[PDB]
Amino acid sequence: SGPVAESWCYTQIKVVKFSYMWTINNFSFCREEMGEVIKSSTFSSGANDKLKWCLRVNPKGLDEESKDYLSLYLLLVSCPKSEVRAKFKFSILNAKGEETKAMESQRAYRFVQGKDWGFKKFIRRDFLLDEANGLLPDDKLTLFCEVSVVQDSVNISGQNTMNMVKVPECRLADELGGLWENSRFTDCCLCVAGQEFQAHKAILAARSPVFSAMFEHEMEESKKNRVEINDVEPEVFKEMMCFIYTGKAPNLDKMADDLLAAADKYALERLKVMCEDALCSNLSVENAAEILILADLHSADQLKTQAVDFINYHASDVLETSGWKSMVVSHPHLVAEAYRSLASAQCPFLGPP
Amino acid sequence: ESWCYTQIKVVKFSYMWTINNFSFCREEMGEVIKSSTFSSGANDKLKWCLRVNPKGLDEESKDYLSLYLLLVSCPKSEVRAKFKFSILNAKGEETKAMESQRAYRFVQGKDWGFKKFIRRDFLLDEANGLLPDDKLTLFCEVSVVQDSVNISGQNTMNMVKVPECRLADELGGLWENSRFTDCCLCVAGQEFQAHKAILAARSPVFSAMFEHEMEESKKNRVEINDVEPEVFKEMMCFIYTGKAPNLDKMADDLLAAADKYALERLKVMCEDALCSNLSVENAAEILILADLHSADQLKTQAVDFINYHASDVLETSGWKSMVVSHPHLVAEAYRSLASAQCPFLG
Numbered sequence: 001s002g003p004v005a006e007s008w009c010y011t012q013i014k015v016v017k018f019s020y021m022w023t024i025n026n027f028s029f030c031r032e033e034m035g036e037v038i039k040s041s042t043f044s045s046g047a048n049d050k051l052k053w054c055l056r057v058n059p060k061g062l063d064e065e066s067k068d069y070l071s072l073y074l075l076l077v078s079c080p081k082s083e084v085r086a087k088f089k090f091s092i093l094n095a096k097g098e099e100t101k102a103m104e105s106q107r108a109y110r111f112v113q114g115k116d117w118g119f120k121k122f123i124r125r126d127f128l129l130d131e132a133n134g135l136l137p138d139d140k141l142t143l144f145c146e147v148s149v150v151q152d153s154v155n156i157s158g159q160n161t162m163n164m165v166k167v168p169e170c171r172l173a174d175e176l177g178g179l180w181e182n183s184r185f186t187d188c189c190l191c192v193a194g195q196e197f198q199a200h201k202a203i204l205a206a207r208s209p210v211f212s213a214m215f216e217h218e219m220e221e222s223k224k225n226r227v228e229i230n231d232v233e234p235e236v237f238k239e240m241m242c243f244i245y246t247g248k249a250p251n252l253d254k255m256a257d258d259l260l261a262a263a264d265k266y267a268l269e270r271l272k273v274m275c276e277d278a279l280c281s282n283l284s285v286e287n288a289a290e291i292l293i294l295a296d297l298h299s300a301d302q303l304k305t306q307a308v309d310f311i312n313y314h315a316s317d318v319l320e321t322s323g324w325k326s327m328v329v330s331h332p333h334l335v336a337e338a339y340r341s342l343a344s345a346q347c348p349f350l351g352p353p
Numbered sequence: 354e355s356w357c358y359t360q361i362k363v364v365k366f367s368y369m370w371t372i373n374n375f376s377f378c379r380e381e382m383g384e385v386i387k388s389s390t391f392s393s394g395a396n397d398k399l400k401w402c403l404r405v406n407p408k409g410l411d412e413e414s415k416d417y418l419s420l421y422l423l424l425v426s427c428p429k430s431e432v433r434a435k436f437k438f439s440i441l442n443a444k445g446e447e448t449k450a451m452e453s454q455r456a457y458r459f460v461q462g463k464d465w466g467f468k469k470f471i472r473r474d475f476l477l478d479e480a481n482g483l484l485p486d487d488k489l490t491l492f493c494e495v496s497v498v499q500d501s502v503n504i505s506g507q508n509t510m511n512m513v514k515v516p517e518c519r520l521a522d523e524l525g526g527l528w529e530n531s532r533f534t535d536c537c538l539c540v541a542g543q544e545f546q547a548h549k550a551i552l553a554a555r556s557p558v559f560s561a562m563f564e565h566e567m568e569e570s571k572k573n574r575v576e577i578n579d580v581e582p583e584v585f586k587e588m589m590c591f592i593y594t595g596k597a598p599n600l601d602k603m604a605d606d607l608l609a610a611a612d613k614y615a616l617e618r619l620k621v622m623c624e625d626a627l628c629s630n631l632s633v634e635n636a637a638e639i640l641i642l643a644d645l646h647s648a649d650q651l652k653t654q655a656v657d658f659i660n661y662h663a664s665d666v667l668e669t670s671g672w673k674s675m676v677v678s679h680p681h682l683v684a685e686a687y688r689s690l691a692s693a694q695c696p697f698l699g
Contacts, residue, residue: 019354025361029498031435033455041357041505165625165650168618172595173520176554185550185563187535201533202548206523215533247520270516277513302513309510351360351504 004160011155015148018045021093022055022143023352027136028129035062035071042077045149051084052077055143056116059125066121070128073118074145076111084111087148090119095137099144108150177246189225190241195234199241207244210266232262243271252278257294264298276303283310289323296334308341315342356506365494366393372405376477376487379407390425400426403438403493408473418473420451422466422493424459432459434497441492443485524551525594540577540585547589555592558614584610591619601626605642612646624651631658637671644682653689660690 020043024030032038035058042052054075061071074088089104101123109117127133135141179185183198190197201220205212219227232240236258243249252259252274260275276295280303283291288311295304311318315338318324328335347353368391374381388404402423409415422436435456440446450471457465476483527548534546549572553560562571577585584606591597597619600607608623627639628651636659643652659666666672675682 020357021355022357022359024359029435030361031455036433038359038501040359041355041503043355043357046354046507046509163625164654165621165628167621167625170521170595171618172524172555173518176520176551179550179554185553200535200548200550202527202535202550203524205532206527207520220533247518270518273513273516277515280513306510345506346356348504351362352358 004162006160006162007158008160009155009157011153013150013153015150016045016047017146017148018047019147020053020055020143020145023140026139027059027141028139030059032058033060036060051079051149053147055145056118057143059128061121061125068125069121070123070125071118071120072122073116073120075116076113078113079111081112084149085109085152086111086150088117089146090122091144091146092123092135093142093144094135100135108148173246173248177242177248180241180245187224188220188227190227190229192229192237193233197234197237197241203245208266208268231265232258236262240266240268240271244268249274253282256282260294260300261298264300272298272300273302276300279303280306283307285314285317286321287323288314288318289321289327292334292338293327293331296331296337308337311338312342312345354508356504356508358504359501360504361498361501363496363498364394364500365496368393368403368491368493370403370491371488372491373488375405375407375489376484384408384410394428399428401493401495403491405489405491410468414468416473417469418471418476419468420466420470421468422464424464424466427459427461427463428497429499430460431499432497433499434459434495437496438491438493440490443490444482446483521595525590525596528589528593536572536575538575538577538585538589540580541582543582545585545589547593552592556614556616579613580610581606588614588616588619591616597622604630608642608646608648612648620646620648621650624648627651628654631655633662633665634669635671636662636666637669637675640682640686641671641675641679644679644685652685656686656689659686663690 022040030038037056038058040055042054044050044052054077056073056075058066058071058073061067061069063071072090074090076084085108087105087108089102091099091102094100103119103122105119111117131139180199186198186200188198188200190199201211201215205215214227229237236255239249239251239255239259240262249259249271256275256279260272260279263271263275279291279294283306288307292304292307292311294300295307370388384406386404386406388402390400390402392398392400402425404421404423406419406421409417409419420438422438433456436453438452451467451469453467459465475481531546533548535549536547536552538545538547549563553563562575580588584603587597587599587603587607588610597607600622604623604626608620608627611619611623624643627642631639631654636655640652640655640659642648643655659672
C-alpha cells in the first residue's frame with residue numbers, strides 16, 4: 001500500500017562482480033603432464049587492491065582421476081583471514097567474443113591462504129584438442145570467468161518519520177532560472193554576433209572566473225554596458241546563459257561541440273564536464289579525428305583519454321577516413337600521442353602480436 | 354580485466370652443418386665422435402653442439418643409430434624445453450624418424466638427448482632411399498619454451514565523474530563575499546549589501562517595491578526595521594543559498610519574517626520546525642502564532658493537538674488568555690472538535 005510503514009530497513013549483502021581474461025599461445029605446444037604447474041598474473045577485483053587471485057590450469061590433468069581430462073584450478077594469493085566464501089564460474093570465450101560453455105559452481109566456496117578450489121575435469125582432453133569445434137583460433141585457448149565475492153552482511157535501519165507537514169522542494173534554480181528568460185533587474189548588455197543579450201555581473205562572477213576577472217578590471221566604471229564577445233554564436237550563448245543562471249543544460253546534445261569550446265573559453269568546469277560526457281556518448285568510427293582534435297584544442301582531459309582509448313581500440317577502420325589524413329598534415333603531434341597510446345597498451349612489444 | 358595472457362614466446366634459430374663420407378666413417382675412426390661447437394641465441398651467449406654417431410657408443414646401443422643432442426652448457430637452470438629437431442626435406446622424410454614427444458629439464462653441467470634414432474641395418478640399406486648423396490644436412494632449431502612471465506593490462510574505462518551542481522554554495526559564497534552589490538539593506542542601523550535581481554527573483558515582496566517607480570530613492574536607502582539583525586541575516590542566507598542552517602533554534606521570529614516577505618518555502622519550513630515542537634504549555638501560543646501569520650498547516654496541527662490534549666491544555670495560562678484575546682480561535686477549536694468527530698454514544 002506504500003503507507004511509509006514508519007520504520008524501514010534496507011539490508012544489502014553487497015556482492016562485487018568482476019572478470020579475468022586469460023589467453024595462452026600455442027595451447028597444444030605446452031603438454032604440462034601430471035600436475036606440472038603453470039601460473040598466471042595475480043589479479044584483484046579492480047575496486048581497490050585488498051585480495052589477489054591467480055588461475056592455475058593443467059592441460060594434462062593431475063592424478064589418475066583427471067588423467068584424460070583437463071584440470072583447472074583457481075588459487076588464492078592473499079586475503080584477510082576470514083574464510084572467504086566466494087563464487088567462481090568458468091567458461092571458454094570463442095573468437096567472436098561470446099560465452100559458449102557455461103560451468104557454474106553451485107555454491108560460494110571457502111578460501112584461505114594456500115587453498116585453491118576449482119572445477120576439476122573441466123573439459124575432456126579428446127574434446128578439448130578437437131580443433132573442429134573452432135574454439136582454438138591459432139591454437140589459442142581463451143578463458144572467461146565471472147566471480148561474485150561477498151562481504152557477508154551490511155544492513156541499514158530506520159527511520160522515515162511521519163512528516164505531517166509537506167515542505168515544498170527547493171525552487172532556487174527554477175525561480176532564479178526565470179530571471180534570465182524574463183531578463184528583469186539586469187543592467188549590463190552582452191552582445192554576440194550582433195545580437196544583444198542583457199545580463200548582470202553578480203551571477204556571472206559567481207559562476208565563471210573569466211567574467212569575474214574581465215568585469216572588475218576598470219570596464220564596469222565606464223564600459224559596463226557594452227562588452228565585446230564574438231568567439232561564439234547566439235544559439236549556444238543562450239544555452240550558456242541559461243546554464244549559468246539556472247544550473248541546467250536542456251539543449252546539450254545539439255550543441256555539444258560549440259558549447260564545449262565556449263565553456264573552455266570561459267572556464268566553466270562543470271559545463272565542460274557535461275559537454276564532454278554528452279559528446280563522448282556520440283563517439284563513432286567516422287568522427288574520431290574531429291573529436292580528438294576538439295579535445296586536444298580545448299584541453300578536455302577525460303574526453304581525450306576516452307578518445308585515445310576509442311581510437312586505440314578501433315584504429316582498424318579510422319585511418320582510411322579523410323579525418324586522419326587531414327589530422328596527420330595538420331596535427332603531427334596528435335599522431336605522436338596516437339602512436340604512444342597505441343604502441344604501449346594492447347600491442348606493446350608483439351605480445352599479443 | 355587483466356590481460357595476463359602468459360606470453361610463451363620461444364627462442365629458435367637456424368643452423369647448417371654437413372656430414373661427409375657418412376657411409377664408411379665407422380671403418381674410418383669409429384664411435385667416439387667430436388664435432389665443432391657453435392654459439393647462437395641472445396648475441397651468441399648460448400652454446401650448443403650437434404653431431405651424429407654412426408654406431409652405438411655402448412654395447413647396448415649397437416642396434417639402433419644414435420642422434421644425441423649434446424649440451425655441455427644450458428641457457429638457464431630451469432629449461433622445460435621440448436626440443437624438436439627437423440630437416441629441410443633433402444628427401445621425403447618427416448615421419449617414422451624419432452621426434453621428441455617428451456623432453457627432460459636441462460640443467461647447467463648436464464647434457465640430455467635421445468640415443469635411439471633408427472635401425473643401423475635398415476639405414477645402411479640403400480633400398481629404402483635414405484642416402485641423399487651420402488650426406489645429410491642438419492637444421493637444428495632448438496625450441497626453448499620456459500619463458501612465460503608475463504604481461505598484463507587493467508583495461509578500465511570508468512565513464513565520467515559528472516560533478517554535482519554547486520549553485521547553492523556558489524551563491525552562498527557570493528552573499529558572503531558581497532561582490533558587485535547593487536543595493537544596501539539597512540537593518541537596525543547595521544547595513545547589509547545584497548543584489549537586487551536575486552532578491553526580486555526569490556522573494557516577491559522585495560520584487561514589488563523595486564517596480565512601483567520608487568527607484569531614484571529606495572535602491573540604496575531601503576529601511577528594514579520591523580525585523581531584527583539575526584533574523585534578517587538568516588533570511589538573507591535562505592534567499593541566496595536556499596538552505597536555513599540556524600532555523601531550528603529561532604522558529605517563531607523567523608516565521609514572522611518569512612510571513613512579511615512572502616517567502617513560502619521558508620514559511621512552511623518554519624511551520625515544520627514549530628509543528629514538531631508542540632508542548633501542552635505553549636500550544637495556545639503556537640496556535641496564536643500560526644493564526645496570526647496565516648500559517649494554515651501549523652494552525653491545523655496545533656488545533657488537532659489541543660483537541661487531543663484538551664483535558665490538560667485548558668488549565669494553562671496561554672489558553673486562558675486566548676479565550677479573552679482570540680475568541681474565534683476557540684471557535685475554530687470547537688468546530689474541529691465537534692464537526693470533525695462524533696457521534697459518541699451520548
